[PDB]
Amino acid sequence: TSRRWFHPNITGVEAENLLLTRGVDGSFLARPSKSNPGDFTLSVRRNGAVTHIKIQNTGDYYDLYGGEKFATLAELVQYYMEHHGQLKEGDVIELKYPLNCADPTSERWFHGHLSGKEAEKLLTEKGKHGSFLVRESQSHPGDFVLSVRTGDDGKSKVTHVMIRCQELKYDVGGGERFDSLTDLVEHYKKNPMVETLGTVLQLKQPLNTTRINAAEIESRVRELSKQGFWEEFETLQQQECKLLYSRKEGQRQENKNKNRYKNILPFDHTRVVLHDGDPPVSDYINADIIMPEPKKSYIATQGCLQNTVNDFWRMVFQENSRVIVMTTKEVERGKSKCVKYWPDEYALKEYGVMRVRNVKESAAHDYTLRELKLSKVGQGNTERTVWQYHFRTWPDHGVPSDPGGVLDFLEEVHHKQESIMDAGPVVVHCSAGIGRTGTFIVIDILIDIIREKGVDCDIDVPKTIQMVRSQRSGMVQTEAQYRFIYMAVQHYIETL
């Protein structure tokens, strides 16, 4: 739950030097890769030396070189910290001691270069009782300032507390000295400073710095392009450790082969439970209800395996879904993503107790549309049309350069969904069901707000992503997908 082992601004040489002087055999940290941006490096110390393991993420999952594939860095660390003997270098290396980071740049409450007047301006417009921030010092270079709002919602005040940096330790002028600003902040959240006149300086929540008005999107993107996108994303990534809910149902022996990737699993409290099977384990599918928080919901799931095809159609029928969104080709760069789970055009196939007819195909440039009729074998009045939107112009590397094709796609998907009475969640899948799947769903949630409320509405991209990640681990995988979400929201605003 710490995630302090991730160092955002460290190099390979600084990683070796930090592990050789402050760490011991078994100490580790994780950092961005400097040789190949977009990837990550796990730096472990063993037998008095440091080894560096490559962690790739092209948009679908974190892939440990010589290891396994994971939905988040936190889950990768947590896995190998409890599965010693599994991390192979080809000797075995252990993750014993997280080397914690003292750089507070990825913290929600850290602002850096900020004046006192501006700190009061931001805490006035967006802050409430307990909102706080930590900024670099105005009057005393090297020091820091803690600015807290206290009042009721001239009944409120902003209090500034100086934070001296003495010998690489931090203090508020008296008491204990801390090795990092994070340690000082975590101390004074649990034991808040009390003023002479009784005012308790509670540090309830950090000040929101990402919620913007939809009309300010062009300004915000220009500010994040001069880089701000990387910092805003890694601040979101630091909060994935609060989303380590139980995934025990996917870890069962009976459900191991129902996952495309053994470690990328749904949460127990949001997974799709399948009812009425055959009496072993017939209730499991690697899928999660995504509910934004009528209201449009989503089922984020993985690409189909050969042995989960029947389970897929049971889910579509049981959840009453009428629209399926497919975010990858059947085959991409020679590797099999989704297996074909639909019949050829005009053909009829039976998948277990479910019966699917491919009625018509319509081929646009960005996607293929397939009108399918799904029914339960042997029953009348169970037939419903399911519309499959197979997006096929997503590039093999990175994100699309122009978000227009994705938006027009989503616009079509949304109107067909709205046209069907009592439609269930929209199914979005392919590959591991977290990368492209999360990007499509997050864009569609934000674009939904703008479509119904116009340009005068607050959007908060990291808050929307974090809310989605609590229902399926790893939704939105890379910093390029994060930027693409902004680009798509901005492009939708401009076409209004």
Side-chain angles (χ1 to χ4, degrees), residues 1-21 23-53 55 57-83 85-87 89-112 114-116 118-120 122-125 127 129-151 153-154 156-167 169-175 177-189 191-201 203 205-222 224-225 227-230 232-247 249-261 263-292 294 296-305 307-334 336 338-348 350-375 377-380 382-407 409-451 454-462 464-482 484-493 495-496:
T1 47
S2 61
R3 234 233 181 201
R4 304 279 301 284
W5 39 264
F6 185 85
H7 298 238
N9 297 295
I10 206 184
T11 67
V13 187
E14 296 170 318
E16 302 183 28
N17 198 63
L18 207 61
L19 285 166
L20 282 170
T21 57
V24 294
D25 288 351
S27 299
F28 66 94
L29 53 82
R31 52 182 182 86
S33 177
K34 264 72 182 59
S35 62
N36 200 31
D39 296 332
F40 297 87
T41 306
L42 181 63
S43 292
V44 195
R45 169 175 167 168
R46 24 99 238 174
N47 307 128
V50 179
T51 177
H52 301 279
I53 317 153
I55 304 168
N57 195 326
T58 57
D60 307 313
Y61 46 71
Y62 298 88
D63 183 12
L64 193 293
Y65 189 84
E68 294 164 38
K69 295 164 186 178
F70 296 90
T72 65
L73 287 165
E75 290 172 359
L76 186 157
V77 164
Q78 176 182 297
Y79 176 88
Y80 290 115
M81 281 190 70
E82 307 168 328
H83 286 51
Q86 280 285 22
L87 195 63
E89 136 195 303
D91 317 357
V92 159
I93 50 168
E94 312 201 275
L95 301 186
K96 291 183 171 175
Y97 311 107
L99 197 298
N100 292 335
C101 185
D103 196 325
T105 37
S106 291
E107 299 283 340
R108 297 152 62 190
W109 41 255
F110 191 75
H111 289 53
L114 197 75
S115 65
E118 181 78 319
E120 291 185 319
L122 294 162
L123 284 165
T124 296
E125 301 169 327
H129 173 72
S131 300
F132 68 102
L133 61 87
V134 178
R135 52 180 186 86
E136 283 162 15
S137 181
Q138 2 86 294
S139 319
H140 308 74
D143 289 354
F144 292 92
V145 177
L146 171 70
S147 308
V148 198
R149 203 210 205 202
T150 309
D153 303 315
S156 256
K157 60 162 170 289
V158 173
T159 312
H160 294 264
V161 187
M162 220 69 47
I163 296 173
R164 295 187 65 178
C165 186
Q166 295 178 110
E167 293 289 307
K169 306 240 201 191
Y170 305 101
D171 55 75
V172 301
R177 297 173 61 198
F178 305 94
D179 287 289
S180 63
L181 291 174
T182 310
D183 291 320
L184 184 151
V185 167
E186 289 294 321
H187 173 89
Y188 289 114
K189 294 152 81 178
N191 304 116
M193 290 173 276
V194 185
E195 282 184 333
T196 45
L197 298 205
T199 286
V200 181
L201 295 178
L203 315 175
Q205 62 281 321
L207 174 77
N208 191 302
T209 53
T210 53
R211 183 172 74 253
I212 55 172
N213 184 250
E216 294 174 54
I217 186 69
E218 196 169 34
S219 300
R220 190 50 148 252
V221 170
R222 204 183 302 108
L224 294 168
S225 298
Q227 202 152 6
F229 279 118
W230 185 85
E232 202 181 63
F233 180 68
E234 294 294 347
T235 302
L236 173 60
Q237 299 290 86
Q238 186 67 2
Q239 303 171 74
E240 76 192 3
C241 264
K242 297 185 171 175
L243 310 168
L244 288 167
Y245 307 114
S246 69
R247 305 131 56 201
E249 293 298 327
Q251 290 165 324
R252 295 169 70 175
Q253 173 67 31
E254 306 85 298
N255 295 333
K256 289 182 176 181
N257 291 76
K258 307 176 177 177
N259 310 304
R260 295 243 313 174
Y261 306 90
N263 304 291
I264 300 176
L265 303 157
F267 287 126
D268 297 330
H269 72 286
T270 62
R271 80 186 177 92
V272 177
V273 187
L274 305 172
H275 315 111
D276 288 313
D278 192 301
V281 177
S282 56
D283 75 328
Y284 178 87
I285 186 176
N286 195 317
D288 298 281
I289 302 294
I290 307 305
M291 189 72 71
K296 190 200 302 185
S297 59
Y298 310 88
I299 295 182
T301 181
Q302 67 181 21
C304 278
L305 287 160
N307 62 314
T308 64
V309 175
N310 293 351
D311 290 317
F312 185 86
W313 289 112
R314 285 176 58 208
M315 180 181 69
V316 176
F317 183 88
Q318 174 191 297
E319 297 303 317
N320 201 24
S321 300
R322 312 302 184 87
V323 174
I324 299 165
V325 169
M326 183 161 173
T327 63
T328 79
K329 308 193 182 89
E330 289 155 76
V331 171
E332 295 198 349
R333 60 200 327 249
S336 177
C338 283
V339 313
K340 192 173 196 287
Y341 58 86
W342 61 93
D344 295 320
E345 193 180 25
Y346 306 121
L348 181 61
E350 281 190 1
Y351 300 98
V353 296
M354 294 311 167
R355 180 181 276 145
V356 179
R357 186 175 211 105
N358 186 356
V359 179
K360 199 66 181 68
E361 291 192 11
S362 306
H365 171 76
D366 287 314
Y367 66 95
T368 298
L369 176 52
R370 287 190 262 265
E371 183 181 345
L372 316 169
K373 286 178 178 297
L374 163 72
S375 48
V377 172
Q379 289 193 32
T382 59
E383 177 191 320
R384 78 283 318 273
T385 306
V386 175
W387 303 87
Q388 188 202 32
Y389 285 83
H390 186 180
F391 194 91
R392 35 103 117 100
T393 59
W394 189 279
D396 293 317
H397 301 95
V399 297
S401 46
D402 176 52
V406 166
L407 291 169
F409 177 86
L410 267 47
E411 195 76 22
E412 188 60 35
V413 168
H414 169 86
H415 284 104
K416 208 136 219 163
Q417 177 75 4
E418 186 168 354
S419 81
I420 303 165
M421 182 78 56
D422 290 337
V426 174
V427 180
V428 186
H429 69 79
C430 267
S431 183
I434 62 184
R436 292 185 210 182
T437 300
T439 300
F440 271 79
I441 288 177
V442 162
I443 292 173
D444 192 76
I445 291 168
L446 305 173
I447 257 66
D448 234 295
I449 301 168
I450 301 162
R451 187 192 293 106
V455 81
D456 283 325
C457 40
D458 292 332
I459 77 168
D460 195 343
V461 181
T464 303
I465 297 174
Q466 179 80 356
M467 174 270 296
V468 173
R469 284 173 176 187
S470 59
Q471 301 175 70
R472 178 161 178 96
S473 211
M475 298 281 277
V476 188
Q477 276 291 284
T478 65
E479 199 230 288
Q481 294 164 341
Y482 187 76
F484 183 80
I485 291 169
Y486 267 96
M487 291 307 195
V489 173
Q490 179 186 239
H491 193 280
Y492 189 85
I493 296 286
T495 62
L496 233 340

